[PDB]
Design an enzyme around this catalytic site. Structure first.
Site, short mmCIF file in Angstrom:
data_model
loop_
_atom_site.label_atom_id
_atom_site.label_comp_id
_atom_site.label_asym_id
_atom_site.label_seq_id
_atom_site.Cartn_x
_atom_site.Cartn_y
_atom_site.Cartn_z
N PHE A 79 13.72 60.06 45.58
CA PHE A 79 13.32 59.77 44.21
C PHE A 79 14.49 59.20 43.42
CE2 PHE A 79 10.25 60.73 40.77
CZ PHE A 79 11.07 60.70 39.66
N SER A 134 24.51 62.45 57.97
CA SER A 134 23.84 63.60 57.37
C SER A 134 22.45 63.79 57.94
CB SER A 134 23.78 63.44 55.85
OG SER A 134 24.99 63.88 55.25
N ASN A 192 29.03 66.93 54.68
CA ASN A 192 28.94 65.48 54.81
C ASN A 192 28.26 64.87 53.60
OD1 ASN A 192 27.27 62.91 56.02
ND2 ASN A 192 29.29 63.15 56.96
N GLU A 208 15.51 65.69 36.07
CA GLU A 208 15.36 64.43 35.34
C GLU A 208 15.13 64.61 33.85
OE1 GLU A 208 15.86 61.53 36.66
OE2 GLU A 208 15.79 61.99 38.80
N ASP A 240 19.65 55.72 31.80
CA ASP A 240 19.96 56.73 32.80
C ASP A 240 21.47 56.83 32.98
OD1 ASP A 240 20.70 54.68 34.55
OD2 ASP A 240 19.14 55.10 36.01
C1 LIG Z 1 20.41 63.14 53.66
C2 LIG Z 1 19.00 62.62 53.95
C3 LIG Z 1 17.92 63.47 53.29
C4 LIG Z 1 16.53 63.09 53.79
C5 LIG Z 1 15.74 62.20 53.07
C6 LIG Z 1 14.48 61.86 53.53
C7 LIG Z 1 14.00 62.40 54.71
C8 LIG Z 1 14.79 63.29 55.43
C9 LIG Z 1 16.05 63.64 54.97
#
Ligand SMILES: CCCc1ccccc1
Ligand SMILES: [Cl-]
Length: 162
Positions: free
Chosen positions: A104, A117, A132, A11, A20
């Site tokens: 975040f 994912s 993915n 960041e 941003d």
């Molecule tokens: C691709 C999801 C990443 C993630 C974010 C928060 C908690 C588990 C996994």
């Protein structure tokens, strides 16, 4: 490395209001002020966040306090979300940082839609998850940062940040 060092790299640190990557008014270490196009709205949000009349400028101490609050908020968003928490709890400590990084940047709701994912990560199919995750607007709009985060999920090491 830890989550604070990781996000400080991703960041940066700016002590005056800036835009941003999406054009939104931001300050500090990636603290979003508002999505409104009005600089005056952004300045009002900043004064409310800091508790004083800042005129668009903060100190390093104030930036680091917002950063602590924002990281805490990201972790709490994961722990309260029924789709994210089980995946987060299944990960090792380094990959947990990559998860916090994504929340975040994109928010709890945005990450919770990465349904395929999330399943691959919970199953520890790291190469498949990495492929993915790259099929996303996220990867195409901020590819260098996404590559660092994806490499962290793929390897469970800090190699992309060293
Ligand atoms: C691709 C999801 C990443 C993630 C974010 C928060 C908690 C588990 C996994
Ligand atoms: Cl990038």
């Amino acid at each position: 490395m830890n989550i604070f060092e990781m996000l400080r790299i991703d960041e940066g640190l700016r002590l005056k209001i800036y835009k941003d990557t999406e054009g939104y008014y931001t300050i500090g270490i990636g603290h979003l002020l508002t999505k409104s196009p009005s600089l005056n709205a952004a300045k009002s949000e900043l004064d409310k966040a800091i508790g004083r009349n800042c005129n668009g400028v903060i100190t390093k101490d104030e930036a680091e306090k917002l950063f602590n609050q924002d990281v805490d908020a990201a972790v709490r968003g994961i722990l309260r979300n029924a789709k994210l928490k089980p995946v987060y709890d299944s990960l090792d400590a380094v990959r947990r940082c990559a998860a916090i990084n994504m929340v975040f940047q994109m928010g709890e709701t945005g990450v919770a839609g990465f349904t395929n994912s999330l399943r691959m990560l919970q199953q520890k199919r790291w190469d498949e998850a990495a492929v993915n995750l790259a099929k996303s607007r996220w990867y195409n709009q901020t590819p260098n940062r996404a590559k660092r985060v994806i490499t962290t999920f793929r390897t469970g090491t800090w190699d992309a940040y060293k």
